């Protein structure tokens, strides 16, 4: 009767930045979707390929809980077949993505009057990211053909930029904590079912 660490993911004190979104593998435990509903609407709760009602009696092999923080106007990019900053450079979801996306405002927790610069996103990249690929290297992005020599300058910019969340931000720019539950079904016993 070991409940899966969903409280560890959702009730984490500090979420991770989107460019290195915190991926946690959940397996060999009772999946407690029985309490993910009484927390009311968060701001968004969308299950692609499955239904929220039928999330109690279906077996999964591995549950990939991808927790990060983005802005409100940009969480719409957390969806299969979407284009944007997160999809191209930070977090890509495949067209055949079967899972759920939980987005809740966190202005109270992830905002500072002086500005919460601890959250970063990759604004520039040579090519778009493949699904479920993380790039953490902070090499200077080369825009032109001239060499950059690892120093910022003309056509040479640092890939990572700052959300800088503040409590007075609008709903579209407020710090929204997003957890993407990715469900995989392979030739495995799939020990994550839940009564």
């Amino acid at each position: 009767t070991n409940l899966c660490p969903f409280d560890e993911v959702f009730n984490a004190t500090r979420f991770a930045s989107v460019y290195a979104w915190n991926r946690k593998r959940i397996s060999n435990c009772v999946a407690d979707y029985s309490v993910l509903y009484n927390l009311a609407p968060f701001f968004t709760f969308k299950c692609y390929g499955v239904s929220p009602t039928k999330l109690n009696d279906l077996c999964f092999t591995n549950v990939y809980a991808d927790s990060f923080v983005i802005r409100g106007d940009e969480v719409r990019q957390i969806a299969p077949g979407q284009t944007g900053n997160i999809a191209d450079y930070n977090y890509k979801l495949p067209d055949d993505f079967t899972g759920c996306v939980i987005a809740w405002n966190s202005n109270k927790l992830d905002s500072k009057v002086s500005g919460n610069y601890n959250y970063l996103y990759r604004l520039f990249r040579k090519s778009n990211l493949k699904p479920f690929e993380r790039d953490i290297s902070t090499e200077i992005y080369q825009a032109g053909n001239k060499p950059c020599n690892g120093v910022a300058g003309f056509n040479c910019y640092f890939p990572l930029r700052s959300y800088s969340f503040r409590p007075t931000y609008g709903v579209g720019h407020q710090p929204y904590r997003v957890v993407v539950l990715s469900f995989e079904l392979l030739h495995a016993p799939a020990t994550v079912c839940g009564p």
Partner: antibody, heavy 118, light 108 residues
Framework: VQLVESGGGLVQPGGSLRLSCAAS????????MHWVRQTTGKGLEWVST???????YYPDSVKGRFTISREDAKNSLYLQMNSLRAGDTAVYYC??????????????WGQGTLLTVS | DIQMTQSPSSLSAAVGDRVTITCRAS??????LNWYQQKPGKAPKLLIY???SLQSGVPSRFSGSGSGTDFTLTISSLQPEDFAIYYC??????????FGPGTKVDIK
């Protein structure tokens, strides 16, 4: 198996109503009920969903306005509607949903009831 | 949200003919589609689920095919009672399910 709707009528704008659906021929504590409304032109439109473990889902334009509920002892489904606007005039149907694995579908609906606002 | 479209908007066919109606989603949705039939004065009734499977009790003359973005519903033989409005509904994105605009099949 049957579903019967009731509660339709003419109400003033900004009022409230309580629509009801009675289900028979199947266990009510195993199916997830839905409310789907239909208007001329705009076609069918999903309005509400309630599942087994006390969870309620509504669209963006409906969330915070309606309230779905169920009674397993009476095997009944209820829908509170408040702050009614001119766009709520529709034929409402109560739906039984079942999933053949990963694919979700509405098996059977009821007869529907017409709600109009003046 | 995923906007859903159907074609043709209006259609007329004779009894015993074979007809095909197409449905298109704003983005790839896989095989998560359902087909409903609504006769005038009656609530819509489920015909096809998962875009390729037959509901229990419906005649086999209804068939569904297609995956991704384009789907087709085919009636090999048309009956006089088939005059109705047909809806395609995507089950990929939940709980905000969306229905097609509805295609009208008449009798010639």
């Amino acid at each position: 198996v049957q579903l019967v709707e009731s509660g339709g009528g003419l109400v003033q704008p900004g009022g409230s109503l309580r629509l009801s659906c009675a289900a028979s021929g199947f266990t009510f504590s195993s199916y997830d009920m839905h409310w789907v409304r239909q208007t001329t032109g705009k076609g069918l439109e999903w309005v509400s969903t309630i599942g087994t473990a006390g969870d309620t889902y509504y669209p963006d334009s409906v969330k915070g306005r309606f309230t779905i509920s169920r009674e397993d002892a009476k095997n009944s489904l209820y829908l509170q509607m408040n702050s009614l606007r001119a766009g709520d005039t529709a034929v409402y149907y109560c739906a039984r949903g079942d999933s053949s694995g990963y694919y979700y579908y509405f098996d059977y609906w009821g007869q529907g009831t017409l709600l109009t606002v003046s | 949200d995923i906007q859903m479209t159907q074609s043709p908007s209006s259609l007329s066919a004779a009894v015993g003919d074979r007809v095909t109606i197409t449905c298109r989603a704003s983005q790839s949705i896989g095989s998560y589609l359902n087909w409903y039939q609504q006769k005038p004065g009656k609530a819509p009734k489920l015909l096809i689920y998962a875009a390729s499977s037959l509901q229990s009790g419906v005649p086999s003359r209804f068939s569904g095919s297609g995956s991704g973005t384009d789907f087709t519903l085919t009636i090999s033989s048309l009956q006089p009672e088939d005059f109705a409005i047909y809806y395609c509904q995507q089950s990929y994105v939940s709980p905000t399910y969306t229905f097609g605009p509805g295609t009208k099949v008449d009798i010639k």
